[PDB]
Write a protein that binds this DNA or RNA. Structure first.
Ligand SMILES: [Mn+2]
Ligand SMILES: [Mn+2]
Ligand SMILES: [Mn+2]
Ligand SMILES: [Mn+2]
Ligand SMILES: [Mn+2]
Ligand code: NA
Length: 325
DNA sequence: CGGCATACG
DNA sequence: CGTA
DNA sequence: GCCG
């Protein structure tokens, strides 16, 4: 089992769901305390279990697995022996974890803001609503729409949204294309948001496109919130006899960059961090959602496909549905 | 021990 | 600071 | 927290 998540297929569903979910609780809690290193290790350990071909039944089976040391192994051993890990359960019911999770899931609130509010004695959403001047426009939108934004987006919602975005994109720039990315491209049946990548086959024609798209969506009454090449919006999505707010991310890239943007925006987040880590540390190349740079020759790799990028990096190709690290 | 991904709004 |  |  290789040490980087981008070196192994990781399917959306797998054979160690309970074990991986426990480790991901500890990863999330490490993040809430600002320990990005411990977050990464717990995330990586969880992802290793997602990539295994069958269930872990005995501690023996962790021998040799990357990212399993004394701590993550003890977590698994307790789950295998008692069905519960005392540390995980202690985190789950802690006031700190519950409140940081509630606050950080608000659009516009990150760990640093949530932590400051926590230290001020704040604990509930109504606590935040009671002092609106302590809030950005983005946070006000996140809190007004919080209930809708907490309900999963379904694949049925996605196709309706894509037709709407395509209509606005086609008026903004005939010939421009809209590609579904994010978790839905990896096969997820639900999501917290919808992600779209927009390009045009003639290099340079995409310049200035996103403002034109947003104006047209706004004129159609579809934009509940917006604040360039990336737009983080809240869309008004029709529902039987009403509607609901949905988070939508719109991204524009020139066709030269489109494979890199597609790769980055398709995720998963851990897969992309691992891919960039692998690129730099094992291949000496610098990867982002714009391109792949050789800092010794000071040149950018040209890619026409995701397949090109995996080949450049010496990695076997993984389709999106196997990037669920 | 140092490193831990890398951008834009 | 937020966002992906 | 783990790896090299
Ligand atoms: Mn420990
Ligand atoms: Mn998404
Ligand atoms: Mn998104
Ligand atoms: Mn750019
Ligand atoms: Mn150290
Ligand atoms: Na947030």
């Amino acid at each position: 089992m290789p040490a980087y998540a981008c070196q192994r297929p990781t399917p959306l569903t797998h054979h160690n769901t309970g074990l991986s979910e426990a480790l991901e609780i500890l990863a999330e809690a490490a993040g809430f305390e600002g320990s990005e290193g411990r977050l990464l290790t717990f995330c990586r350990a969880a992802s290793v279990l997602k990539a295994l071909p069958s269930p872990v039944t005995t501690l023996s089976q962790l021998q040799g697995l990357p990212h399993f040391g004394e701590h993550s192994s003890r977590v698994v051993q307790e789950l295998l022996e008692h069905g519960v890990c005392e540390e995980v359960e202690r985190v789950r019911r802690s006031e700190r974890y519950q409140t940081m999770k509630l606050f950080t899931q608000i659009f516009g609130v990150g760990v640093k803001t949530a932590d400051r509010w926590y230290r001020e004695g704040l604990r509930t959403l109504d606590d935040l609503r009671e002092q609106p001047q302590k809030l950005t426009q983005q946070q006000k939108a996140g809190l007004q729409h919080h209930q809708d934004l907490s309900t999963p987006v379904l694949r049925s919602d996605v196709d309706a949204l894509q037709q709407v975005v395509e209509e606005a994109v086609g008026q903004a720039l005939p010939g421009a294309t809209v590609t579904l990315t994010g978790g839905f491209r990896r096969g997820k049946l639900q999501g917290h948001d919808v992600d779209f990548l927009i390009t045009h086959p003639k290099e340079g024609q995409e310049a200035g496109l996103l403002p034109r798209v947003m104006c047209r969506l706004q004129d159609q009454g579809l934009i509940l919130y917006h604040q360039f090449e990336r737009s983080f919006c809240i869309f008004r999505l029709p529902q039987p006899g009403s509607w609901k707010a949905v988070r939508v991310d719109l991204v524009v890239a020139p066709v030269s960059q489109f494979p890199f943007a597609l790769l980055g925006w398709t995720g998963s987040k851990l897969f992309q961090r691992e891919l960039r880590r692998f690129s730099r540390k094992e291949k000496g190349l610098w990867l982002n959602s714009h391109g792949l740079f050789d800092p010794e020759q000071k040149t950018f790799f040209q890619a026409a496909s995701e397949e090109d990028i995996f080949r450049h990096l010496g990695l076997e190709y993984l389709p999106p549905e196997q990037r669920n690290a």
